[PDB]
Each structure stands twice: as C-alpha cells, then as structure tokens.
Amino acid sequence: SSQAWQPGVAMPNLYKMQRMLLEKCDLQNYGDSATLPKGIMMNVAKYTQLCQYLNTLTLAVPYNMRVIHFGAGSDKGVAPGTAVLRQWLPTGTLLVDSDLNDFVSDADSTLIGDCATVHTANKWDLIISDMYDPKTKNVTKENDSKEGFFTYICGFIQQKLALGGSVAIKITEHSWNADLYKLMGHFAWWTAFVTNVNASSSEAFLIGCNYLGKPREQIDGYVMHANYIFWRNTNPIQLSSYSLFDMSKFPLKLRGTAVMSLKEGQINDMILSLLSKGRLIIRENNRVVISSDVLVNNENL
Amino acid sequence: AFAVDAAKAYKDYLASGGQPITNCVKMLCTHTGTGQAITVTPEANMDQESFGGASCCLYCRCHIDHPNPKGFCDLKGKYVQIPTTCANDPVGFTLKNTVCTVCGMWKGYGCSCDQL
Ligand SMILES: Cn1c(=O)c2c(ncn2[C@@H]2CN(C(=O)[C@@H](N)CC(=O)O)C[C@@H](O)C[C@@]2(C)O)n(C)c1=O
Ligand SMILES: C[S@@+](CC[C@H](N)C(=O)[O-])C[C@H]1O[C@@H](n2cnc3c(N)ncnc32)[C@H](O)[C@@H]1O
Ligand SMILES: [Cl-]
Ligand SMILES: [Cl-]
Ligand SMILES: [Cl-]
Ligand SMILES: [Zn+2]
Ligand SMILES: [Zn+2]
C-alpha cells in the first residue's frame, strides 16, 4: 500500500527462507514506465532511490570513506550513477568509478577497461556495481549462474572489502551469480532491493550490509535466486517516482565510524558485534592507490 | 602557436542553430539551496536546476584539454547550478558566464555585489 511512497521494495525475509525452483520471471507491469520528474534520467532516479534505501540501513560511514563504483559509464558517455553517489556520500569521500568504455565522470578517479584489469592496494568501505550485459536477456536458453564480471566482484569483495563495509550489486533474472548470493551470507544482513522507478524490471540490487569476512549463515545461491524470482513473480510492485520529490533527508549521515587495523586473531565477538551494528570498519587507513592493467601489443607487420 | 579553440567553435555552432550538447546529468534536489554557481553538493534554488559538473564542462565532454595551464577542471567533481530558463544548454551557459569570486553567484544571475 504505502509501498508507493518508499524508494523501493526489499525482498521480505520469509521469501529468503523458501526452497523454490527457478522459474521464468513474468512481471505483471512489464513494459510500463514510471513518470519521472521533468528532465530526470532513469539512472539518476534509480540511483537516488537506491541511496534513499541505503539510508535506512546501518552503513558504516567513516571519515575519509572509500567508495568504488563499477559499471559507471552510460551509453551517453557520462556517469549519472556516480553523480548521485557523490551527491549522497559526504563531501570529501574518495570515489573511484570504472567501466569498459570511455566516459566522463565526477569521480575522483576513473579507470577504463574490463573490471578484471582493475587493481587497488587498499580496501573499501562501499562497493557499488551496475555492471550488466544486456545480451543475457536471451529467453530461449537456460538460465544458469553467470560468471564473467561476477567472478571478479566476488573475489574483489573477499579481498578488498573492509570488514563492516557494504555492497550493492545489480542483478537481473538472467544476470546473477550463485556465489554472490552465497557471499551475502557473509554480511550481518542482506536483501534484494527493487527501486520503485524500475519496478517493471527483474532488476534488483543485491545489498550486503556490514561485511564480516566469514559465513554468518549458509546460503545456496541457486535456491536464493529462485526465491528472488518467486518473490518478484508473485508480488507486483507499483511503479512510483514519489520518493524522488523529497530530498530533504537524502545526504548520507557522516557517522564518523571508527576505523581500526586489526588482525584475524583479534576479531572477537565484541568486534563482530560492533561490525554487525555499523559501528566499526577494519582496514588500514593508508593512501588510496589504484591501477588498470594494460595489455601491450605491436601489430606492425 | 596553433591551439584549437573549442569554446569559440561551440559558440559559433550555437549561433548558427546547432542543437546544444545534451545528456547533462541533472540531479534531484530540494531546490531550497544557496543558489551559488558551483558547489560541492547540489545547491539549486527555486529558479535553478543542479547538474553534475563534469557533464556540463565543454572540455570534459569533448575529450579535449582544459584551458587551465594545469589542465584542472572547474566543474568536474562538483555541481553547477543553471538558471531553469537556460537549462536547455548547460554547457553553453557555463561557457558564456562567469562566477563572482566574492559571493559565489553567477554574474548577472544572482550576483548583487555591484548593486547600490
Ligand atoms: C524479457 N522479459 C519479458 O518478456 C517479460 C518479463 N515479464 C513479463 N514478460 C512478458 C510480458 N508480455 C508482454 O507482452 C510485454 N510486452 C508486456 C506485458 O504484457 O507484460 C507477455 C506475457 O505473456 C508474459 C511475458 C513473460 O512474455 N520480464 C521480466 C523480462 O525480462
Ligand atoms: C547500463 S551500464 C551502467 C549504467 C551506469 N551505471 C549509469 O548510471 O548510467 C552497464 C555497464 O556495465 C558495464 N560493464 C558491463 N560488464 C563489464 C565488465 N566485465 N567489465 C567492465 N565493465 C563492464 C557495461 O560496459 C556497461 O557500460
Ligand atoms: Cl538458501
Ligand atoms: Cl582483517
Ligand atoms: Cl559532445
Ligand atoms: Zn572539465
Ligand atoms: Zn557577487
């Protein structure tokens, strides 16, 4: 009912607990579009509602926060999502973004190329991914767990996500990965969030809230994606742009979350409890250094 | 002694009836902000629209060097407030106009430093 005035809808817990079999996704309002405010792009509206929902979770927001944004380029050559993230994040937050093709961005640093070529010395407090290949929308072929950039994302999380950090990874009916669902169980909380502006799409953002670096619960990713599609298939979401008109509480709150360097032996239950509540980030606070691998070739003769 | 002059090229292209650069990233905001020209977060007032800075910079958008000898961009990483009446061409607006270094408002679009 009041769902239309929320930024979107999150997958209810009871649907996470089912053991469904994967079916084709059939959305009641497929093809319909929400009425965006005059001159607002879909991607600005999408990212705005994503951030509005993230405002309701227990995100760690330390001083000198570090955020990386994969799949940040549009076919228009600009970065709408990055612009919203920078608006949302506290001023001064280090924001890196990346995409396969060249684009102009407001991020502090931009890396062009396949995400597998991206390397960083440091860990991150928040990872956003809108990476997507629309050639996965082939209804005539079986829908199996996908690899590609999902394999990179899973490894990047386990290797470069600070404990206490969070992620939001875009998925669809066909663009998904079982290990990523399983990785959601390594956070204190997780969900699949559907924006109200794009409710006619099987798209969702898989959100992991406060990373713990170890399985808190065991999740079968093939079953959980089937659970997600079942939820989508039986719960029509009313397209709505209502929340885009109230931006008074949009900025992410600079919680000044504490950052500590700690070693696997020191991570006790007191620490794990603080991590689970969005009250602690564990990583070094050194300088942020990134790079893009470049393949070298001489094609003469 | 040869440097391409993109600013003049866009001005002539506009004068001769060319479509302004599109896909400038317009932000959602309250439109109760300070109204200043270039800010670290959207600051549009009731009579402005707020845009992502890089998307409104001629040099960023055209993949050409910035006139700053250091190559530094005034807009990238920030947000530019455009008068709603001119929002059909943010790149053209930021090119043709100047920010008052005293009050931070656009000269002739909010700057009253020169009034008495
Ligand atoms: C590729 N793809 C779809 O095709 C799709 C879909 N949800 C529903 N459908 C179509 C809808 N449909 C149409 O005719 C549409 N033009 C609009 C409409 O009527 O809903 C016919 C209907 O029988 C069911 C179905 C499955 O075929 N999702 C999430 C998706 O990714
Ligand atoms: C629709 S786009 C992102 C839209 C963008 N977030 C915005 O706000 O406009 C999906 C992106 O995923 C990118 N991308 C997809 N797969 C990738 C991969 N393996 N490696 C690097 N980039 C990828 C595509 O190049 C594509 O630009
Ligand atoms: Cl499960
Ligand atoms: Cl550690
Ligand atoms: Cl252009
Ligand atoms: Zn620029
Ligand atoms: Zn002035």
CB pairs under 8 A between A and B: 73
Residues A70-93: b if buried by 16+ CB within 10 A, e if exposed: bbbbbebbbbbbbbbbbbbbbeeb
Q: Are A115 and A91 in contact (CB under 8 A)?
A: no
Give the 3-state secondary structure of residue B83: strand
Phi, psi for residue B29 in degrees, rounded to 5: -155, 175
Does ligand 1 have an atom closer than 6 angstroms to the CB of A25? yes
| Method for this entry | X-ray
- Do residues B89 and B10 make contact, with C-beta atoms less than 8 angstroms apart? no
Per DSSP, the three-state class of A190 is: strand
Residue A174 CA, closest ligand 1 atom number: 31
The dihedral through the CA atoms of B38, B42, B45, B47 has a sign that is: positive
Length of chain A as a residue count: 301
- Residue A69: its H or E element: strand A66-70
For A237, the token pair is: 């979401």
Q: Indicate the DSSP class of residue B63.
A: T
Instruction: For residues A252 and A260, give the distance between their C-alpha atoms in angstroms, rounded to a whole number.
Output: 21
Which of the residues of A are catalytic?
A: 46, 130, 170, 203
CA-wise closest residue to A190 among A12, A7, A4: A12
Alpha helices by DSSP H, chain A: 13-16, 42-54, 80-88, 149-160, 178-184, 221-234, 269-276
From the list A32, A129, A142, the residue with the least C-alpha distance to A73 is A129
Q: Which amino acid is at A94?
A: L
Question: Kind of pairing, strands A124-129 and A161-171?
Answer: parallel
CA B92 to chain centre: 7
Q: Among B78, B73, B76, B81, which residue's Cα sits nearest to residue B99?
A: B81
| Of A147, A189, A149, nearest in space to A166 by CA | A189
Say how far apart CA B114 and CA A203 lie, in whole Å: 53
Cβ contact A211:A164 at 8 Å: yes
Nearest CB partner across the interface for B27, out of A77, A83, A107: A83
To which residue do tokens 């227990």 refer?
A: A58
The residue among B23, B25, B82, B85 with the most chain A CBs within 10 A of its CB, best to mutate, is B25
Q: How far apart are CA B55 and CA A83, in angstroms?
A: 9
Residues B78 and B38: their CA atoms lie apart, in Å, by 7
Q: Write the DSSP string, A152-209.
A: HHHHHHHHHEEEEEEEEEEE-SSS--HHHHHHHTTEEEEEEEEESTTTTSS-EEEEEE
Q: What's the CA gap between A138 and A135, in Å, rounded?
A: 7
**Distance, CA of A199 to CA of A9 (rounded, Å):** 9
Report which DSSP code applies to B86: G
What is the resolution in angstroms? 2.0
For residues A16 and A187, the answer to whether their CB atoms sit within 8 Å is: no
- Centre a 10 Å sphere on the Cβ of residue A179 and count the other Cβ atoms it contains: 18
Query: Measured between alpha carbons, how far is B114 from B108 in angstroms, rounded to an integer?
Result: 10
Residues of B in contact with A107 (CB under 8 A): 77
Nearest to B40 by CA among A112, A146, A93, A215: A93
Q: Are B54 and A106 in contact (CB under 8 A)?
A: yes
**Cα-based distances in Å from A208 to A121, A187, A250, B15:** 22, 6, 20, 51
- Residue spans per domain, chain A: 1-301
Inter-chain CB proximity A45 and B78 less than 8 Å: no
CB of A29 closer than 8 Å to CB of A196: no
Domain ranges for chain B, please list them. Answer: 1-116
At position A147, the amino acid (one-letter code) is E
Round the CA-based radius of gyration of chain A to a whole number and report it: 19
Burial of A136 (0-12, 13-18, 19+ CB in 10 A): middle
CA of B101 to the centre of ligand 7 (A): 7
